[PDB]
């Protein structure tokens, strides 16, 4: 019921809901729409906006930056985060080496027209770079004032713990957050592995794709709608997943969850999002939206949160039948 | 082979996580049980306890079973430590046999009410 | 009797009296008067001036900065201090997180038109930010040349000690001072808890409101005078305190202290201020003044200091009847 | 649960403040008494003393009373330490009983002047 939460155990306060920019910004939607989305989010108290060097080859960062500059919002009232890993076709333009982290962040900041991001993330783990180099590089950009904090994304708890111990060993700065995928059909990591890290070393979770790219919205109950993400060019993988075997099983279960939604008095998306926020270990949930209607509806998930009683959660687990073993 | 640091009243000990995980039911072997003693600022577990004893407690894990009391540590003190680290009654009983003890058996009263009343003053 | 004192055990030398800017600068008094006050103070050897991002929403810092720039005083002859905590209505614009400390100080420095302050203070403790983050952030702005030293304000000795041990643990910079409230009717913290810290870890005290906002001046012995702070719009809380039960008891005792003042040959304000300076643990006392007359009178407290004998102090304790238990 | 570090001639010991505060009248239990040994540069108390003994001194606080002399430490040396840390005569006397001693009683001369003069050569 607390709109603002600490990101993990750091002093950074984020809105329990955030707005991301994958697919949409500089891609699927227009710059005017992106501006409309950010304005709605900001005006509704959302202070968390996520992007990445890889989104639309850097265009998502340019669009986000133009809106921030145009709207003139105080930088201190925003929490901007960007992820680093894939930054070019050249061999040295990808990974978590000191070279790419510094060059990647510097280029992202130039596109964003910002002096710094609040949190810079390693978009994924790098088997090819010693943890020490990565932790030292993250620490370096923070000491240079290019970022306030850093975090991991798609890292195992083993790898996150490693980054933490290497930080203590060399007196560096530990990551404060892991950006993990989380929704009714992807629960293992966040529910079974991240909670220990949150209590032990204060690492919080900032989860993405709460509606599994739209799958959990319910819009695909009877085929691929026109203008939906699964229909978009380049997202054949998403369409395949939805039409597959497992795909139909999910849509079947979504129809059962629909009853839970009505008993709670909310829409399916509002329930799927509120559900992600039931665990204290989840600091914030990054939302995706192709238009203003979706955002306005989704933000309503906050009213559902208080209704998620033990009974309701246990019922949802019965329907999903995928509760991870502890 | 994640390393684990255990600080006993200042005395520093290190071992591998898999060494402690060897005995899942003990205090140091169970993540939920040791969680309480972890210090995130120093990446170590801290116990405000008897130092001389711990050398043996850790060796118990390393040797996969051997629980010898240090010659320089009183039996009463060491036993208290064994119970604190929750090594379990099996290893404790096994510990007492070697420390010279065992036994402690022998049925009680008759249980026949009156038969168990005479079997007292005789 | 030593006009200049080390702030705690650091090498920073401050005048035993300093001039603050709460309420007055950019608020109650005019910019011309503020300039007149600073000039009098500076010309009388006072090198310590205190302000805060929260005072008059940043206007106190703008006024102080304009005077320093206009008068052209050498920056090396001044000891400017500013406090950080409340910097805006946004969720991320308050607290002691790394984000707000850096953004807050940077904005204060911009308003002050200075490259750095000599001491930056945490205006109050932050239950929501790990001590490590705070100490690392204070250390960061010092290494960036934005501040020379840092200190705490309204922190318990437990919290100050924590900041100190976290600094030693990570090889960071420990706070050198605590800005605590201190006057004849608020003595517990400074007389009972801070002395141990001063001797143990060198933390000195820079005390504020030596006249309890004017209450100890004696001007309220018979009601709320026109143009006094208690009469000002927004200070109803102060008026209430003065007219309350405890309020009359204080004024009653002030009348008894008036006799002590005459035996010493000084005014009541001069005695109340000199009294705050009797303990070696108090490095300096921050004065408040709405006009030049008050400042000229108050600075005279320095001549009273040598007269505060054991007997006189014990008599003052008898009248106050609030000497804290050690 | 503020932690406290005590450095004995290089040997590092740590405990909780509340553990020492358990015995307010001792040297390490009284803030005013230990103040003299604090090192603000290292955040620790330093004592240029006998190392083998301190293990027992600290355990005395941790165990809430048990004052055993280490088997490898001479009784004369250990007693000097007990007095330095000011554990008090109650625990010292209690320490000597266990270390095998006690007694040391018996009235003196008669006190009757002359009666106490004959009671000498007889
Ligand atoms: N590795 C990483 O760290 C990582 C990876 C991926 C994403 N992320 C973050 O998470 C965010 C993306 O989450 P997501 O977009 O992938 O899943 P969502 O679950 O966040 O996806 C939302 C998308 O699905 C559809 N949708 C949303 N709400 C709807 C509603 N109420 N009714 C109907 N349709 C609705 C929308 O329109 P359409 O169906 O027309 O598209 C929208 O574009 C990104 O902004 C990114 O910053 C992070
Ligand atoms: N948390 C913190 O760290 C903190 C909090 C508060 C203040 N401070 C610092 O301490 C300073 C304020 O101290 P203070 O102003 O609150 O208490 P004082 O005791 O410093 O208050 C002085 C105010 O009371 C009246 N006064 C002073 N001398 C007088 C005299 N000789 N005769 C008659 N009236 C007299 C003045 O006129 P009026 O009665 O007309 O107003 C003046 O505005 C600030 O500048 C600030 O920097 C720090």
Author numbering:
A (entry chain A), C (entry chain A): 36 to 361
B (entry chain B), D (entry chain B): 32 to 153
Sentences copied from the publication:
Here, we have used x-ray crystallography to determine the structure of a complex between CTX and the paddle chimera, a mutant of the Kv1.2 K+ channel from rat brain, with particular focus on the influence of toxin on the selectivity filter structure and distribution of ions in the pore. Charybdotoxin (CTX), a pore-blocking toxin for K+ channels, is a 37-residue peptide isolated from the venom of the scorpion Leiurus quinquestriatus. The architecture of the paddle chimera channel typifies the family of eukaryotic Kv channels such as Shaker, with four pore domains together forming the ion-conduction pathway through the membrane and four voltage sensor domains surrounding the pore.
To further correlate the ion distribution in the crystal with trans-enhanced dissociation in electrophysiology experiments, we crystallized the channel with a mutant toxin, Lys27Met. Miller and coworkers had shown that Lys27 mutants reduce toxin affinity and abolish trans-enhanced dissociation. Thus, it appears that the ability of toxin to interact with ions in the pore (and thus alter the ion distribution) is directly connected to the ability of ions from the intracellular solution to destabilize toxin on the extracellular side through interaction with Lys27.
